[PDB]
Write a protein that binds this DNA or RNA. Structure first.
Ligand SMILES: [Mg+2]
Ligand SMILES: [Mg+2]
Ligand SMILES: [Mg+2]
Ligand SMILES: [Mg+2]
Ligand SMILES: [Mg+2]
Ligand SMILES: [Mg+2]
Ligand SMILES: [Mg+2]
Ligand SMILES: [Mg+2]
Ligand SMILES: [Mg+2]
Ligand SMILES: [Mg+2]
Ligand SMILES: [Mg+2]
Ligand SMILES: [Mg+2]
Ligand SMILES: [Mg+2]
Ligand SMILES: [Mg+2]
Ligand SMILES: [Mg+2]
Ligand SMILES: [Mg+2]
Ligand SMILES: [Mg+2]
Ligand SMILES: [Mg+2]
Ligand SMILES: [Mg+2]
Ligand SMILES: [Mg+2]
Ligand SMILES: [Mg+2]
Ligand SMILES: [Mg+2]
Ligand SMILES: [Mg+2]
Ligand SMILES: [Mg+2]
Ligand SMILES: [Mg+2]
Ligand SMILES: [Mg+2]
Ligand SMILES: [Mg+2]
Ligand SMILES: [Mg+2]
Ligand SMILES: [Mg+2]
Ligand SMILES: [Mg+2]
Ligand SMILES: [Mg+2]
Ligand SMILES: [Mg+2]
Ligand SMILES: [Mg+2]
Ligand SMILES: [Mg+2]
Ligand SMILES: [Mg+2]
Ligand SMILES: [Mg+2]
Ligand SMILES: [Mg+2]
Ligand SMILES: [Mg+2]
Ligand SMILES: [Mg+2]
Ligand SMILES: [Mg+2]
Ligand SMILES: [Mg+2]
Ligand SMILES: [Mg+2]
Ligand SMILES: [Mg+2]
Ligand SMILES: [Mg+2]
Ligand SMILES: [Mg+2]
Ligand SMILES: [Mg+2]
Ligand SMILES: [Mg+2]
Ligand SMILES: [Mg+2]
Ligand SMILES: [Mg+2]
Ligand SMILES: [Mg+2]
Ligand SMILES: [Mg+2]
Ligand SMILES: [Mg+2]
Ligand SMILES: [Mg+2]
Ligand SMILES: [Mg+2]
Ligand SMILES: [Mg+2]
Ligand SMILES: [Mg+2]
Ligand SMILES: [Mg+2]
Ligand SMILES: [Mg+2]
Ligand SMILES: [Mg+2]
Ligand SMILES: [Mg+2]
Ligand SMILES: [Mg+2]
Ligand SMILES: [Mg+2]
Ligand SMILES: [Mg+2]
Ligand SMILES: [Mg+2]
Ligand SMILES: [Mg+2]
Ligand SMILES: [Mg+2]
Ligand SMILES: [Mg+2]
Ligand SMILES: [Mg+2]
Ligand SMILES: [Mg+2]
Ligand SMILES: [Mg+2]
Ligand SMILES: [Mg+2]
Ligand SMILES: [Mg+2]
Lengths: 94, 271, 45, 23
RNA sequence: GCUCGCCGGAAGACCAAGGGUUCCUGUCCAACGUUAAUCGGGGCAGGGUGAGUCGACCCCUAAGGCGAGGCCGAAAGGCGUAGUCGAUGGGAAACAGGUUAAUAUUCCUGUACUUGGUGUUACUGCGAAGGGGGGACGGAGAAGGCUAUGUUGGCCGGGCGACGGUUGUCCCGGUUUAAGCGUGUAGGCUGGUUUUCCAGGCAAAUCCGGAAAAUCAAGGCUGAGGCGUGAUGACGAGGCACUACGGUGCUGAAGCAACAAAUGCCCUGCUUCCAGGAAAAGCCUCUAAGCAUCAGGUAACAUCAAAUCGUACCCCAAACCGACACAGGUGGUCAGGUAGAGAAUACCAAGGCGCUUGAGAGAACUCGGGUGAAGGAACUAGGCAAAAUGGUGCCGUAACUUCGGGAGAAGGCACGCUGAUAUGUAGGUGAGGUCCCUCGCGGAUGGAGCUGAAAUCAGUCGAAGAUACCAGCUGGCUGCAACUGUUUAUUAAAAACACAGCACUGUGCAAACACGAAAGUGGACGUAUACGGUGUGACGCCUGCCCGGUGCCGGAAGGUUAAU
RNA sequence: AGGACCGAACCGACUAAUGUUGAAAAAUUAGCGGAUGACUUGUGGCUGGGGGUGAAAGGCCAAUCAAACCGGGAGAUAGCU
């Protein structure tokens, strides 16, 4: 059984893009932005416990952050993790 | 035998093979092979210590019965195989209880003979029996020199020692190099000349056969520079200095024996 | 031609990495000479 | 912005002799 | 958008290494782009990489590295055993189709497969840090079966031609379908089945090995491809359409046959040669310990899991290595058409590009080229450079020679298209059909259809038939070196170096010798037919004289002679 | 069958011309040699400076080699400019 504060610490944001919206409508997959050291089982348990929604499988990847040049000094944006949580067949979660 | 290769090609013009149908075409015996990594002439420090070693075909070091431990079991020779390591052929020999070994091949050996080691053995080529019981004047090979180590004298292609004397508890050998030598008489020896006695009658033909045997090219002294060798340098061909090894010791005719511990086993020097 | 730097990060980290500097005796004085010099990256790794 | 893309001229590499020498 | 050109064994596609957001959208053109720029691999903001099956991580080792103890060493540390790491190798499992501006063997649809836990049913010898089998291995070649893949016909759909002719023996396009599962073929390999025993595999044995005895000469192992099935599906030229002209949805026929054929598969096979061709785990099996019907094992059956990391893009380059958006360099995989022997070469398809300065004018002179009167090396250091010769089949061929060579010696002839032999021959492939059939992917006459050289005779065209591209200059005397090889990366490729062969010499194995104060290691897991060193440099004929000098080897009788 | 033959990949580097402050701190073009071996190449390992390695040229050891490079002795020394 996973720690409840850990499952409260993992989910950080949803994701807001055209691919995210089309994946939400055509396949019932919510797209989340999760913590850096999350894993698939912890994300699935947290998304079943917090939102209270039945969840089939989870697909994670690691977005590489860009290297920007603000002002004149170069700098590194912070990497993170993106997760395509699908839902069960015929189940709404906004 | 010796089959002069017909001179269809330069380099093939001079080759002489040693063909033999008896050397078993096929596989070795899998419980007796090993791995044998080619050295390159390079010790643990990493340097080239001995030169002109490197390259060649990959070999697998057979394990051989140099100690002849299984006494008292009459052991028939299964087949005759081609050892790449040493000069002589080997004979995979099957024992009575059924544990095969490899023995360095004597002269007139063939698949069918009985080779029996021990002390009880009769005197036929292959039968290893100690020099307390070898008849004097005979010829033997695979001779140990400290009792129970593995054969060390006369185990090349067709070499053989002679047992010229026995007195006290020392046998006196006339070795293949013409040197007479005491050996303690409890050592085992194996009767007969060793097999591949046409191994000197081969020629290599071309430089590629030396590179297949696994020797590099040797660059002689007087075509080098004086940093790289003693005889180096010189405008033209100049060799005015005395012949010396690359580290400054004379080669042509200089005795370099050192071990005083076995000077007691030198009945007569070689000549 | 074939220039004299054909990069390979396996050999790079294996010969000039932090652990390959830390293993020897005058490799630990290499890292202690760059810390006193206060450099940004001590080695490649 | 202001990039100011003017790095210093490190130009001279080496030389050789390579000339028909009066001797 | 329309033309034109170029690559097309690449200047196309997929990757690893490497780089690190360059990928895609929107916006701006200050700087960067060898110019302009609304453009961009430039700035800015946003978006983008989805894995039980691909690859890392993991299990197993090679060369090798670190190496508890230990040996050795002024100190530092050097070596090395147990071990533990180390892939470029070994080890379970996923294909097809569709979508995105950007991912896809990862997403979605369809059909799968693998290893583990758990629990339920039945059954009983399970267990290893061990023994054994297997994993598990070279170069060359040759043949057979196939496949990828193409060509031709059929079939379905479209067309009747901007210019003579074009209802045909016409033109154009399509003619796709996997993994998995069954069937176990072309083939290859192996004698099986059973009983008793054993000086053996550190003990253990029913396993392996070795002997003796009975029965059967057919059981097993391995195996590309085919045929089903997956598939009734998907894909499909196309139509029908709503408009943001960008699109987008529904439907959607034929979907076979013959021949040719790979370097890919059977093949980790077979023949053959000597230069004698990784290791350990997976995996199968035997048992000692012990555990005693507890555990465990194995045939199922359900149920849960398969984590983490890379998956964008370039990847023979404008993004890696070269200071540059640099005619340089860089390893694997896929390899279509027409001639061709060919992956050369010429033109092409799919595809991708026109090399990030252009417009003139048509002087000298320079670079890359084309042709040339008459002569043909007169040029010159020197035929340097150019020019020529070039192919396939046949005729022919000398001096010399180590009998192989020389030799493709030289030198010459034929070469297109069309007709006949023969409306496409010999040969290859084999549909039917017929008979057996140990009945199936079986075997014999049977040759339809398909493909298809090559030769002779005749006719005819051109000045020229290998018509283009590709494609030996030949001969004579001689030096040096036997040859194939290697070198002064970047002014010297040779007559220099090596070389097989010859000889001398050292070395009796705890070798000589080298690297190391030393351990040790190479020598060598080799043993005088071996190894080091030296000189010479195939093969034929040969190697003559000198021991005064300097070396080296043998003497220890005498002179001189150190520490003590 | 062969360190056989002719010849593309691939390795080279023999001749000529062009460039030589170039397109390039050794290259392009046209020819040329080997092209089943003493071949060539990917990936990892090894040998360290009087040392390595060398089919031997005093060659190669990061565009540098009759003894690398980086720091230190060090403001060496210089009857010389
Ligand atoms: Mg992933
Ligand atoms: Mg030698
Ligand atoms: Mg020699
Ligand atoms: Mg030599
Ligand atoms: Mg020289
Ligand atoms: Mg000297
Ligand atoms: Mg002279
Ligand atoms: Mg003289
Ligand atoms: Mg740095
Ligand atoms: Mg073209
Ligand atoms: Mg490309
Ligand atoms: Mg950027
Ligand atoms: Mg773009
Ligand atoms: Mg844009
Ligand atoms: Mg402007
Ligand atoms: Mg501009
Ligand atoms: Mg940009
Ligand atoms: Mg896999
Ligand atoms: Mg391991
Ligand atoms: Mg080890
Ligand atoms: Mg160690
Ligand atoms: Mg210790
Ligand atoms: Mg690998
Ligand atoms: Mg692997
Ligand atoms: Mg893409
Ligand atoms: Mg999925
Ligand atoms: Mg085993
Ligand atoms: Mg082979
Ligand atoms: Mg086919
Ligand atoms: Mg057609
Ligand atoms: Mg018309
Ligand atoms: Mg008309
Ligand atoms: Mg199938
Ligand atoms: Mg990619
Ligand atoms: Mg450009
Ligand atoms: Mg370039
Ligand atoms: Mg082609
Ligand atoms: Mg071409
Ligand atoms: Mg002009
Ligand atoms: Mg001309
Ligand atoms: Mg003229
Ligand atoms: Mg004319
Ligand atoms: Mg004329
Ligand atoms: Mg003349
Ligand atoms: Mg003249
Ligand atoms: Mg003149
Ligand atoms: Mg010429
Ligand atoms: Mg010409
Ligand atoms: Mg002369
Ligand atoms: Mg030569
Ligand atoms: Mg040559
Ligand atoms: Mg070389
Ligand atoms: Mg040169
Ligand atoms: Mg070279
Ligand atoms: Mg040259
Ligand atoms: Mg030793
Ligand atoms: Mg010579
Ligand atoms: Mg000579
Ligand atoms: Mg003489
Ligand atoms: Mg003398
Ligand atoms: Mg004398
Ligand atoms: Mg004399
Ligand atoms: Mg003396
Ligand atoms: Mg050849
Ligand atoms: Mg060229
Ligand atoms: Mg050739
Ligand atoms: Mg030095
Ligand atoms: Mg010199
Ligand atoms: Mg250099
Ligand atoms: Mg010096
Ligand atoms: Mg000064
Ligand atoms: Mg001083």
């Amino acid at each position: 059984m996973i720690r409840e504060e850990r499952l409260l610490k993992v989910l950080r944001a949803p994701h807001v893009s055209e691919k995210a919206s089309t994946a939400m409508e055509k396949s019932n997959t919510i797209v989340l932005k999760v913590a850096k050291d999350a894993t698939k089982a912890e994300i699935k348990a947290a998304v079943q416990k917090l939102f209270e929604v039945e969840v089939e499988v989870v697909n994670t990847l690691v977005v590489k952050g860009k290297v920007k040049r603000h002002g004149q000094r170069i700098g590194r944006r912070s990497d993170w993790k993106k997760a395509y949580v699908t839902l069960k067949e015929g189940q709404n979660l906004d | 035998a010796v089959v002069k290769c017909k001179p269809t090609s330069p380099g093939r013009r001079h080759v002489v093979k040693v063909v033999n149908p008896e050397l078993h075409k096929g596989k070795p015996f899998a419980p007796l092979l090993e791995k044998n990594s080619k050295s390159g002439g390079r010790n643990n420090n990493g340097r080239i210590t001995t030169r002109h070693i490197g390259g060649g075909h990959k070999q697998a070091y057979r394990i051989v019965d140099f100690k002849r431990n299984k006494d008292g079991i009459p052991a028939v020779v299964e087949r005759l195989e081609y050892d790449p390591n040493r000069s002589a052929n080997i004979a995979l020999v099957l024992y009575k209880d059924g544990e095969r070994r490899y023995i360095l091949a004597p002269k007139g050996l063939k698949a069918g003979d009985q080779i029996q080691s021990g002390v009880d053995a009769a005197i036929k080529p292959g039968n290893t029996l100690p020099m307390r019981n070898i008849p004097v004047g005979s010829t033997v090979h695979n001779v140990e020199m400290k009792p129970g180590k593995g054969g060390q004298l006369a185990r090349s292609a067709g070499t053989y020692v002679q047992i010229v004397a026995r007195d006290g508890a020392y046998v006196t050998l006339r070795l293949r190099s013409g040197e007479m030598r005491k050996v303690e008489a409890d050592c085992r020896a194996t009767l007969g000349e060793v097999g591949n006695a046409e191994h000197m009658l081969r020629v290599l033909g071309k430089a590629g056969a030396a590179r297949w045997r696994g020797v590099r090219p040797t660059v002689r002294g007087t075509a080098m520079n004086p940093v790289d060798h003693p005889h180096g340098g010189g405008e033209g061909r100049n060799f005015g200095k005395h012949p010396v090894t690359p580290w400054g010791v004379q080669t042509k005719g200089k005795k370099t024996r050192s071990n005083k511990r076995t000077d007691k086993f030198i009945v007569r020097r070689r000549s | 031609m074939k220039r004299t730097f054909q990069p390979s990060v396996l050999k790079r980290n294996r010969s000039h990495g932090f652990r390959a500097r830390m293993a020897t005796k005058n490799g630990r004085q290499v890292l202690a000479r760059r810390r006193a010099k206060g450099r940004a990256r001590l080695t490649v790794s | 912005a202001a990039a100011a893309a003017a790095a210093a001229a490190a130009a001279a590499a080496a030389a050789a002799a390579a000339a028909a020498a009066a001797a």
